[PDB]
Design a protein around this ligand. Structure first.
Ligand code: CL
Ligand code: CL
Ligand code: CL
Lengths: 460, 165, 459
């Protein structure tokens, strides 16, 4: 049976980097080479300071870099030498054309397929690691077949990532499962078992799942959709809670104690964010439309609409509470990241809430302990920002003379603020809108102080 | 089907009551009855409306799981993927779990459709049309799954079934 | 390979006349027409035939007994045959997926299973009836699934194009003969075998060979293109009434364009018959099933325009009679879907009458050829009893009527004594010409005292 000795990964993103760093760390006999078209990233990985931050990543990398782990701009040679080629390039949503704003753009994947066949001979296993649309591997197979050579045998596999950005290393070292998809043929099965063998170095065989190529591709999309659906479902319940007197945290708990449902991803919020959930669900929906599956497409579309509804709803409550006029009113925005303990603002619910309030002409004072100033300005552009957006260095600068405090990120620090102080210099009536349920248990305190406090999934 | 086991060893017991002194006493009285054989860790106390809503939402979440994998099943037939493979891959995510992920011709029973339909109506009555049509999708997908299955049979028999055994 | 024995399943107006003609031009071939209905067969063997076509009686009598046979022994006729014509009618489904539009293949399916059970060796199986597309795939699948050693069944498509009324003439000198078959060595052989049969009396230039799906589709599209022509000129007719233009003038000017031609450009109250609407609806359904909604709604327009034309015409009558027709006597002249036939299938007269019946009118209907009981049947679901009277002569129908409605272009209506009719009609007396038969008589009728309105002419 074929053993993999040299591995090339195309793309040093948050996918390929940590994955290959871990592989090198658990497979000392295998030479893993990570390459990227961006010279910036490459020089950063070989630098004492890495381009992305993950707990335990810095240690793992330094353990292997030089022995069996290399970061280079020399893609062709790394392809030439490799037994296994990871395709780990991002597939951005199309920003124009057929499928604008929903369909995935395969341009970067197609380029890699053509670059591989150009620089490779003999037997090589080509595995897509990135999130791809279904039947994408057919596109790669078509490029390989059309550009065949004597003594060229390229095998195409699917092996998607499942690491949450924040706990990457732990997720890689101890995954719930590793997914590998391959052709249901002799040659295909060999390629699968080769990749399977690599993971068997540190992953129990019980937790390695083998499927055909399309089930693997589809599983990555569907899994993220199932997760996103959970959030949108509890969020829908939260709106029904505000109308009935029920409490969504109570309901979520009661639901989550059913073992068949579980208690993960049931925390109501202003809306989910990140670079994966909306992107993949939108991609899933488009796929269904293209395959004349309109019932399925509009089924999954509901996950996105509910998330949009949740955000718009939250923004509208604020505006109504301020008598449907927000012009020149100071409003504190606490938290800009899409979740706590990160500087990532990609698809952050804070962006939309802020933008809705900007369409009302509000004076926004935004604070986030981690998110860089320049990032906020970028995420709020297309002039509009200059008039309405002020960025506070500390939370209190933002609540000085403000009508309302809006919490859009579940930062732990917001819970520990001196709200007695905040209230004294706020305009009356003073509002707190808790979009993350972080002040649960503090309500009676804040009320007797003088705040009107509203939150997700609790009747006012 | 597994009533007795579910009662003797429940995942949780749900009790909702008024957030008042008298109400709390009544809750603790009922709570005390279940403490005879149910660990207190598995007894949950909420206000009255959270308890009522929890029963409806729980069945809806379950039904949604089935309709979701069923939707995937239709996308599987169109792509070459396999829903049992996909279900397995999804279900190994601990946050999702592997229960209620078996695709079928459509779910049945006296509770799932009945409670989801009841949930939808409630939302309409409370001017929550976005939420109502969100959960309605669980039912439509189940109807779609059945109709789809029936239509495949008929097409395979050349769109004529008259007097065919 | 030469074709020596021919079996046709179905003695309808399709298989019957077609096979009788083949026998007349192919004396060496033994043609056996079969049907499970013993009634039909004995009529074919009778001095009186079950259907009437000019020159059919002659053609049949030339061959009946020598090389043309009508029998109920289907199994044996299949066994002996080199070529098997499937010629059973394919009725529109009356329930289920595709109700009122989709074709029911049950009779075709039965025939296919009957053939394979009773046949061995090499045989060519040809569908003659108007079938939905991919029907031959269904036949092929039954053959493939029920195979035997040394069984080589070839499936062909050879659709009819005969207008009911001049069948024999259309057969002797057809515009074209259409044969569809698989694009394979074995398939081309079966095609040229059938192609050879028609070469007995049809020039090879007028024999067209296509694949099986092109043949099936061509029959539907051909009728649709025809129906579209009528609906197009009819749509123009409505635009003429609104502009002062005249549809007969416009039709003529259009038709002189060689690229367009002047056939099927005569405006009317709406087209009828057992083929046009049925085939267009079948075409539309096919497009829907194949996720072609744009094409489906494109062709649906042919039906909607025809429905519009009828409804428009009926409303003009009602408006002219002050939007009340209750207990008013109205003469309906002509009930057949076209002149010179007793056929009432999808006749526009049916709908016009029904619209007027829903207003509570007293209809006195006259048609020179159409049987009385057929009218009563075509106007039911009680309502007929109260409102419908059937007149023996036109004058019995116009005696005390408010309006005369012409729904069929019978030549005799042109020659009526409108002076007599007017005297015993109620005033104001209306004539609604739905077939342009009174063109050129307008100034005459007006001076008598009639208000006359017609298709495609401003009042
Ligand atoms: Cl290079
Ligand atoms: Cl503004
Ligand atoms: Cl028989």
């Amino acid at each position: 049976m074929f053993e993999i000795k040299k591995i090339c990964c195309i793309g040093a993103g948050y996918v390929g980097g940590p994955t290959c760093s871990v592989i090198a760390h658990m497979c000392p006999e295998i030479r893993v080479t990570v390459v990227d078209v961006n010279e910036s990233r490459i020089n950063a990985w070989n630098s004492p300071t890495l381009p992305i931050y993950e707990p335990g990543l810095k240690e793992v990398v330094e353990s292997c870099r030089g022995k069996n782990l290399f970061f280079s701009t020399n893609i062709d040679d790394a392809i030439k030498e490799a037994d296994l080629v990871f395709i780990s390039v991002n597939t951005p949503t199309k920003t124009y054309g057929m499928g604008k704003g929903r369909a995935a753009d395969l341009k970067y994947i197609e380029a890699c397929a053509r670059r591989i066949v150009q620089n490779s001979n003999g037997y090589k296993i080509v595995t897509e690691k990135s999130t791809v649309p279904v039947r994408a591997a057919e596109s790669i197979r078509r490029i390989f077949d059309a550009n065949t050579k004597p003594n060229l045998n390229l095998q195409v596999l699917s092996n998607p990532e499942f690491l949450a950005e924040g706990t990457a290393i732990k997720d890689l070292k101890n995954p719930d499962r590793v997914l590998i998809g391959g052709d249901e043929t002799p040659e295909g099965q060999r390629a699968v078992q080769a990749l399977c063998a690599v993971y068997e170095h540190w992953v129990p065989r019980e937790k390695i799942l083998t499927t055909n190529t399309w089930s693997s591709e589809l599983s990555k999309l569907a899994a993220n959709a199932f997760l996103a659906q959970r959030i949108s479902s509890i969020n829908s319940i939260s709106a029904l809670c505000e109308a009935t007197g029920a409490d969504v945290e109570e309901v979520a708990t009661a639901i989550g104690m059913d073992q068949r449902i579980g208690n993960k991803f049931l925390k109501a919020s202003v809306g989910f964010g990140g670079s994966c959930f909306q992107k993949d669900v939108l991609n899933l929906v488009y796929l269904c439309e293209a395959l004349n599956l309109p019932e399925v497409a509009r089924y999954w579309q509901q996950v996105i609409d509910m998330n949009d509804y949740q955000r718009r709803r939250f923004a509208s409550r604020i505006i109504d509470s301020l008598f449907n006029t927000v012009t020149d009113k100071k409003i504190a925005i606490l938290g800009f990241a899409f979740k706590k303990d990160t500087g990532d603002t990609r698809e952050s619910s804070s962006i939309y809430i802020s933008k809705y309030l900007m369409d009302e002409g509000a004076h926004l004072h935004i604070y986030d302990p981690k998110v860089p100033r320049e990032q906020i300005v970028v995420d709020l552009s297309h002039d509009q920002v200059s008039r309405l957006v002020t960025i506070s260095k500390d939370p209190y600068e933002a609540c000085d003379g403000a009508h309302a405090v809006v919490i859009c990120t579940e930062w732990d620090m917001f819970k520990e603020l001196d709200y007695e102080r905040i209230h004294k210099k706020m305009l009356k009536p003073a509002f707190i809108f808790d979009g993350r349920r972080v002040l649960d248990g503090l309500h009676n305190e804040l009320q007797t102080i003088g705040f009107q406090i509203e939150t997700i999934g609790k009747k006012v």
